[PDB]
Amino acid sequence: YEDFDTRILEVRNVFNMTAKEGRKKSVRVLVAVGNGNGAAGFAIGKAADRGDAFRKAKNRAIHYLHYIERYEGHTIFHDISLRFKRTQIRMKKQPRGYGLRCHRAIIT
Amino acid sequence: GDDFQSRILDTPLQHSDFFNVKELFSVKSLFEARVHLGHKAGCRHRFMEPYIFGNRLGQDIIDLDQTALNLQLALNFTAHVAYRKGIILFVSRNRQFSHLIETTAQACGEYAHTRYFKGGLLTNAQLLFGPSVRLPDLIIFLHTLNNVFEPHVAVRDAAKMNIPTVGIVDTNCNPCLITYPIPGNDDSPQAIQLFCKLFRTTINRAKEKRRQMEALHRLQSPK
Amino acid sequence: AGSRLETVGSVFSRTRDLMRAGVLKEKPLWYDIYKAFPPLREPVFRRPRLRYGKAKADIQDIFYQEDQIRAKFFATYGSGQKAFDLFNPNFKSTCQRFVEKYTELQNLGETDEEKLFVETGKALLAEGIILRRVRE
Amino acid sequence: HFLFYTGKQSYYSLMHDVYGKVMQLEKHRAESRDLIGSRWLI
Amino acid sequence: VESFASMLRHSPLTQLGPAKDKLVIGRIFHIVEDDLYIDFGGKFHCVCKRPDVDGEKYQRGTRVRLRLLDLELTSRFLGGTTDTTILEADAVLLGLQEIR
Numbered sequence: 001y002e003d004f005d006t007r008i009l010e011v012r013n014v015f016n017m018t019a020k021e022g023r024k025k026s027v028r029v030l031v032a033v034g035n036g037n038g039a040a041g042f043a044i045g046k047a048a049d050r051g052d053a054f055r056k057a058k059n060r061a062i063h064y065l066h067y068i069e070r071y072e073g074h075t076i077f078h079d080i081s082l083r084f085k086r087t088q089i090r091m092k093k094q095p096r097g098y099g100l101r102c103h104r105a106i107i108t
Numbered sequence: 109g110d111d112f113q114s115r116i117l118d119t120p121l122q123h124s125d126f127f128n129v130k131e132l133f134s135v136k137s138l139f140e141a142r143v144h145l146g147h148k149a150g151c152r153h154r155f156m157e158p159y160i161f162g163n164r165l166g167q168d169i170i171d172l173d174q175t176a177l178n179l180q181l182a183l184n185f186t187a188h189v190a191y192r193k194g195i196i197l198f199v200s201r202n203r204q205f206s207h208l209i210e211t212t213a214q215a216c217g218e219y220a221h222t223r224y225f226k227g228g229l230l231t232n233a234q235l236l237f238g239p240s241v242r243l244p245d246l247i248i249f250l251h252t253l254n255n256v257f258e259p260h261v262a263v264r265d266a267a268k269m270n271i272p273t274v275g276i277v278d279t280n281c282n283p284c285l286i287t288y289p290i291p292g293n294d295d296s297p298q299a300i301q302l303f304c305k306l307f308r309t310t311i312n313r314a315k316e317k318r319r320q321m322e323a324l325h326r327l328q329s330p331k
Numbered sequence: 332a333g334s335r336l337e338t339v340g341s342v343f344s345r346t347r348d349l350m351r352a353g354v355l356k357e358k359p360l361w362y363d364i365y366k367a368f369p370p371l372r373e374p375v376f377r378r379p380r381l382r383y384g385k386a387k388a389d390i391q392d393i394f395y396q397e398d399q400i401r402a403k404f405f406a407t408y409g410s411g412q413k414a415f416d417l418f419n420p421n422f423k424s425t426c427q428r429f430v431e432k433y434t435e436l437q438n439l440g441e442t443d444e445e446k447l448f449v450e451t452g453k454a455l456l457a458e459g460i461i462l463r464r465v466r467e
Numbered sequence: 468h469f470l471f472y473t474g475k476q477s478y479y480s481l482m483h484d485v486y487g488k489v490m491q492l493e494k495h496r497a498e499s500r501d502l503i504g505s506r507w508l509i
Numbered sequence: 510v511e512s513f514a515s516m517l518r519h520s521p522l523t524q525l526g527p528a529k530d531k532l533v534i535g536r537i538f539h540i541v542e543d544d545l546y547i548d549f550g551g552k553f554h555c556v557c558k559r560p561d562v563d564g565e566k567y568q569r570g571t572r573v574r575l576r577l578l579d580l581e582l583t584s585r586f587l588g589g590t591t592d593t594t595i596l597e598a599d600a601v602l603l604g605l606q607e608i609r
């Protein structure tokens with residue numbers, strides 16, 4: 001998968017209280033992958049070591065590849081407004097040279 | 109050489125009924141086997157109402173005209189897959205028909221899994237079976253519900269792996285994820301026996317046609 | 332690398348997308364078959380929902396015109412003492428013979444239901460069928 | 468083997484044979500102690 | 510060729526009308542100890558108990574007489590969204606059918 005790139009979107013140090021260890025820490029990583037040609041996916045990997053959470057999330061996301069339709073290879077086909085849970089996103093189709101003017105995660 | 113291989117694999121797709129599966133069954137044949145009998149109205153699934161002819165005093169009746177159309181498509185698809193030497197797996201958790209379905213698969217030359225389905229069998233196959241295990245190319249669900257009246261795990265797991273599924277779907281079943289749903293009775297022994305014969309005759313015809321198709325094209329190469 | 336997303340699209344559309352992306356280099360063997368002989372409906376996921384308010388299903392109660400006659404026969408004589416044989420595809424029950432004769436008289440032009448019910452009983456009595464008018 | 472995808476092809480192949488034998492005996496129709504001082508294999 | 514609509518109208522099951530307290534002929538196909546599994550031509554079989562009288566007569570293939578009650582035993586329960594079904598029919602075994 002040399003044509004695919006992986007980017008990190010969040011690294012969290014959550015805690016699970018245990019009788020043996022008290023507060024126990026794991027690394028929860030959210031990553032996204034894409035080949036820059038319409039195919040992309042995301043996954044979450046959890047482990048006790050950060051390096052392991054990177055491997056788990058990176059190889060899991062390659063199994064959930066969406067294909068996204070791009071108008072003329074540079075933009076969305078039409079405006080998109082949606083609510084996912086309590087997060088609202090309002091995307092707009094723009095002409096060439098407009099660039100990405102979006103949340104930093106959306107730019108990634 | 110290359111032309112012959114193209115002829116074997118590309119010619120069957122230029123005919124609407126290359127294997128003549130239409131003759132195997134008829135609306136009358138299905139009605140004799142009680143394939144139009146569904147569960148009571150209380151057990152009805154919302155996505156099965158398109159296929160229901162009506163409610164005869166509480167018992168949903170399955171339109172055997174839609175069943176004939178859908179069965180033709182499902183049998184036609186199952187034949188081309190068998191023609192191309194794909195792996196076909198019969199799946200059911202109904203224990204009354206466990207031995208019949210395992211015997212059917214053996215007669216066809218294919219595979220059956222009528223036992224407890226292990227979580228990850230298809231999504232985690234390489235762990236459970238080995239490094240280079242080849243997964244099924246088609247799964248035929250004679251029963252799509254498990255013994256706790258829930259969808260068989262392999263319906264979702266076959267979609268996750270992008271495997272087409274031919275399933276018998278009674279009035280209480282969920283056909284949305286079945287690629288080729290066949291609306292019909294799944295409980296009666298005479299209905300299940302009919303479907304098993306149809307899938308067995310169809311697969312053997314498709315396998316036999318491939319043998320004949322290869323001999324004719326192969327013979328032409330020297331001749 | 333694949334698309335284990337069974338709630339978006341269908342197995343065929345997801346396989347079409349993976350090949351367009353460049354991840355799936357060889358067509359599956361079932362692909363060309365699906366392209367030529369697709370199912371009637373696209374196999375896409377849909378979440379079942381309950382009906383609310385005044386939404387109702389669209390299932391016709393199957394009631395033929397013979398049932399009006401059959402209901403009377405069961406109320407007046409019950410089920411025929413001869414047992415139903417549902418394995419014989421051409422079985423003729425005592426009630427079905429009553430409804431066949433009741434129809435014949437109605438074709439002649441009798442308009443009174445009472446006339447057709449008592450005359451039919453007489454005709455079957457001549458045939459020798461044992462009809463017991465069991466109020467119990 | 469046609470029972471490969473069960474994961475216990477040999478256990479289920481044997482349970483297939485004994486269940487088919489049982490069916491033929493039940494359909495077709497003395498002391499059963501033909502062997503004594505024996506145990507089932509562990 | 511007869512249509513499905515005609516086949517349904519002239520079907521023995523359509524003639525039966527309501528299946529409560531009707532008399533039907535069944536065939537024993539499976540026996541488990543003193544439990545008889547009887548096919549009476551419907552979707553689901555019934556399961557009755559071997560009568561004390563003439564118990565040996567009730568063997569596989571033996572045709573019997575029954576009094577139907579339900580073709581499928583189902584019931585929705587408090588808080589349920591669908592009817593629970595036991596995939597069985599209800600009938601009372603009356604005795605062997607006279608071969609005559």
Ligand SMILES: [Mg+2]
Pocket residue numbers: 147278279280293294295
């Ligand atoms: Mg069913």
